[PDB]
Amino acid sequence: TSHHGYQPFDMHNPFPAYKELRQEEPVMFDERIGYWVVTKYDDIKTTFDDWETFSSENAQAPVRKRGPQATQIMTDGGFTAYSGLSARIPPEHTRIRAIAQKAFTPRRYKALEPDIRAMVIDRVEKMLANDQHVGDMVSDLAYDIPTITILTLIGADISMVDTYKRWSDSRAAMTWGDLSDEEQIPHAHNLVEYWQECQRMVADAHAHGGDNLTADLVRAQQEGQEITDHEIASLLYSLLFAGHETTTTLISNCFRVLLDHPEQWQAILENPKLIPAAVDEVLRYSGSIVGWRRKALKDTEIGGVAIKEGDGVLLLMGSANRDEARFENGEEFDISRANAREHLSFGFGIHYCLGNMLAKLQAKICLEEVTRLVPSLHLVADKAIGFRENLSFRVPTSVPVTWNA
Numbered sequence: 555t556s557h558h559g560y561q562p563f564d565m566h567n568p569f570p571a572y573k574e575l576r577q578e579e580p581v582m583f584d585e586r587i588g589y590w591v592v593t594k595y596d597d598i599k600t601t602f603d604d605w606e607t608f609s610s611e612n613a614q615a616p617v618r619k620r621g622p623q624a625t626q627i628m629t630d631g632g633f634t635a636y637s638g639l640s641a642r643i644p645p646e647h648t649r650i651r652a653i654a655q656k657a658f659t660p661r662r663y664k665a666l667e668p669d670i671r672a673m674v675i676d677r678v679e680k681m682l683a684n685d686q687h688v689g690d691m692v693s694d695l696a697y698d699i700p701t702i703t704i705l706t707l708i709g710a711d712i713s714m715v716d717t718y719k720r721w722s723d724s725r726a727a728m729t730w731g732d733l734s735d736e737e738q739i740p741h742a743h744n745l746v747e748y749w750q751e752c753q754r755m756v757a758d759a760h761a762h763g764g765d766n767l768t769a770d771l772v773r774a775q776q777e778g779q780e781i782t783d784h785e786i787a788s789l790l791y792s793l794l795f796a797g798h799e800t801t802t803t804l805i806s807n808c809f810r811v812l813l814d815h816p817e818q819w820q821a822i823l824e825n826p827k828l829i830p831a832a833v834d835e836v837l838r839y840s841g842s843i844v845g846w847r848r849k850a851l852k853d854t855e856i857g858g859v860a861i862k863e864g865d866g867v868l869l870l871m872g873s874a875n876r877d878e879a880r881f882e883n884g885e886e887f888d889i890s891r892a893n894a895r896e897h898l899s900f901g902f903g904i905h906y907c908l909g910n911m912l913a914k915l916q917a918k919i920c921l922e923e924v925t926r927l928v929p930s931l932h933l934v935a936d937k938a939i940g941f942r943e944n945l946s947f948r949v950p951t952s953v954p955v956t957w958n959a
């Protein structure tokens with residue numbers, strides 16, 4: 555290979571290539587995707603931190619250029635969205651993030667803990683009633699929970715879980731997938747639908763108020779806060795995607811990785827108090843996002859390597875998280891790892907994940923109830939888990955499990 559084993563869209567096990575890259579070419583120009591690929595912890599954290607030099611404005615630009623058909627569909631369909639927050643830059647970013655944070659209050663979703671817990675228990679019970687004692691932590695638990703949670707917060711109809719998963723799959727594929735022009739066409743139609751619904755919900759809040767995040771955002775604007783209807787709709791476009799896709803993945807990975815480390819699953823059974831540190835280590839070792847993008851605003855350097863104004867940068871947090879310079883025996887999963895929260899799976903700096911607490915809350919509750927109700931849980935077999943191809947999102951498509959009668 556010419557890129558040290560790195561295959562940009564191959565999500566099944568990228569960590570040996572990350573390791574090779576850190577040692578051999580820590581800042582590597584990859585012409586196959588058009589980015590400087592960055593793999594060391596210190597280089598990645600410094601780049602996140604320096605927002606004045608490295609803009610996030612390309613974080614939502616498609617990795618593969620939008621072809622003619624998709625372009626026509628989305629133009630004809632009134633698609634005018636780009637980024638609610640992640641790819642905005644100051645001063646717009648600063649203004650809109652502050653308004654989002656003030657509506658997205660911690661006390662608002664922690665009041666959903668009992669509903670989330672009851673929901674988890676219901677799914678576990680339904681799974682255990684299966685006619686073969688075989689389950690899948692993705693379809694039988696992780697799929698629904700964060701989705702219903704974020705839909706409830708935003709004020710969307712919870713019967714639309716399957717629709718939002720289709721819209722979410724399409725955003726993930728369109729923007730970070732290796733799609734042909736023809737493959738972009740169904741996703742384009744879905745993105746059009748998605749954006750129309752975001753706008754519809756802002757209009758509905760204007761007309762009828764409500765008790766949710768959308769209505770709160772409209773009430774802020776009504777009280778004089780500077781945020782337009784297009785910006786509120788864009789915050790919905792953001793939250794109705796970012797607010798569940800990666801948490802579904804996280805919950806899935808919690809079971810995938812822990813069930814593969816029986817000694818540590820057993821520790822969790824024995825002491826449920828270890829679960830939050832366990833989630834920290836799953837986030838380091840198996841974060842939902844392994845790479846995120848930046849754009850150089852001027853000639854600069856990363857790790858001593860010259861980067862041109864306008865060059866794209868792919869920061870591989872999945873690699874940062876294994877860097878021996880920051881994490882001793884970094885390739886090993888260890889729930890007791892004291893500095894696991896130094897991980898960069900939520901980013902760092904001005905765009906740092908808005909919903910990180912909500913995501914950890916749901917992972918914790920899932921682990922608490924599943925370990926309580928099915929301590930004998932284990933993987934169906936080895937080599938039974940595949941990952942969808944994507945530049946940035948590392949998504950196990952299933953986690954087949956079984957248990958004792």
Ligand code: HEM
Pocket residue numbers: 602610639640641651704792793796797798799800801802804841842843846899900901902903904905906907908909910912913
């Ligand atoms: C479940 C695991 C999650 C992971 C691994 C994750 C990861 C990330 C990452 C890597 C970023 C970009 C960080 C940066 O550019 O510095 C980000 C930003 C963001 N995330 Fe999360 N996220 C998760 C869950 C959530 C949830 C549950 C929500 C909403 C409830 C959320 C909402 C957002 C928003 C709105 C931004 C943009 C913030 C900004 O640009 O100021 N995320 N997240």
Ligand SMILES: Cc1ccc(OP(=O)(O)O)cc1
Pocket residue numbers: 614636637638639640641788791792793795796
């Ligand atoms: C990780 C992430 C964060 C925000 C997103 O949505 P926008 O804020 O619309 O860019 C998408 C993915």
